[PDB]
Design a protein around this ligand. Structure first.
Ligand SMILES: CC[C@H](C)CN(C[C@@H](O)[C@H](Cc1ccccc1)NC(=O)O[C@H]1CO[C@H]2OCC[C@H]21)S(=O)(=O)c1ccc([C@@H](O)CO)cc1
Lengths: 99, 99
């Protein structure tokens, strides 16, 4: 679809068999989700944002469906203020900016 | 134009008589700019992201040109590591997400 930006670009995602809401975030290199249980192995990592750095669990090669489009990539889980979908997955679903 | 998201969507902006590089960021409600000594009145504000909050100065009715597209609105100035064009101005230049 074409998404205007008068409201937050919030969409429903499916990950680990569970539905969630997440923000399409072109300013994020990576995808960061709030604390949750995910199956498989993970590795501890750090990620930095506007206010500093947080510890996250890195899950690689995770199936995630975004607004009806499938992606398989890295998902970081940790104390992010909101679920954000970053460019690593936005590219997979064919997302572009247009003006 | 159309901007793919393989790399950060950085564009040139003009504000306060200065040219800068900034992110077209659908994940930001507001526009956040690196420290710069703009004239005029302002109101303190705090915005939160990954890592916590930073203190910024809110300036209103600021003229800003983004890829030759003119806009005017609120800009937040503070110790951000990157210049961020948020939805308050992306809507004014006709920017959409498409997939
Ligand atoms: C809460 C949702 C997100 C987190 C909100 N942010 C926008 C988001 O695009 C930031 C921009 C950014 C920040 C610092 C460095 C690089 C890019 N990207 C980001 O953190 O990405 C992470 C994951 O991938 C990596 O790549 C880049 C960093 C890593 S914000 O800047 O903190 C923000 C908070 C409140 C407001 C107010 O106006 C009300 O909205 C405006 C903006």
């Amino acid at each position: 679809p074409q998404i205007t930006l008068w409201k937050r670009p919030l969409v429903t995602i499916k990950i680990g068999g569970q539905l969630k809401e997440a923000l399409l975030d072109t300013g994020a290199d990576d995808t960061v989700l709030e604390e949750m249980n995910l199956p498989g192995r993970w590795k501890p990592k750090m990620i930095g944002g506007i206010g500093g750095f947080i510890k996250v669990r890195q899950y690689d090669q995770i199936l995630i469906e975004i607004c009806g489009h499938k992606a398989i990539g890295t998902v970081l889980v940790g104390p992010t203020p909101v679920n954000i979908i970053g460019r690593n997955l936005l590219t997979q679903i064919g997302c572009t900016l247009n003006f």
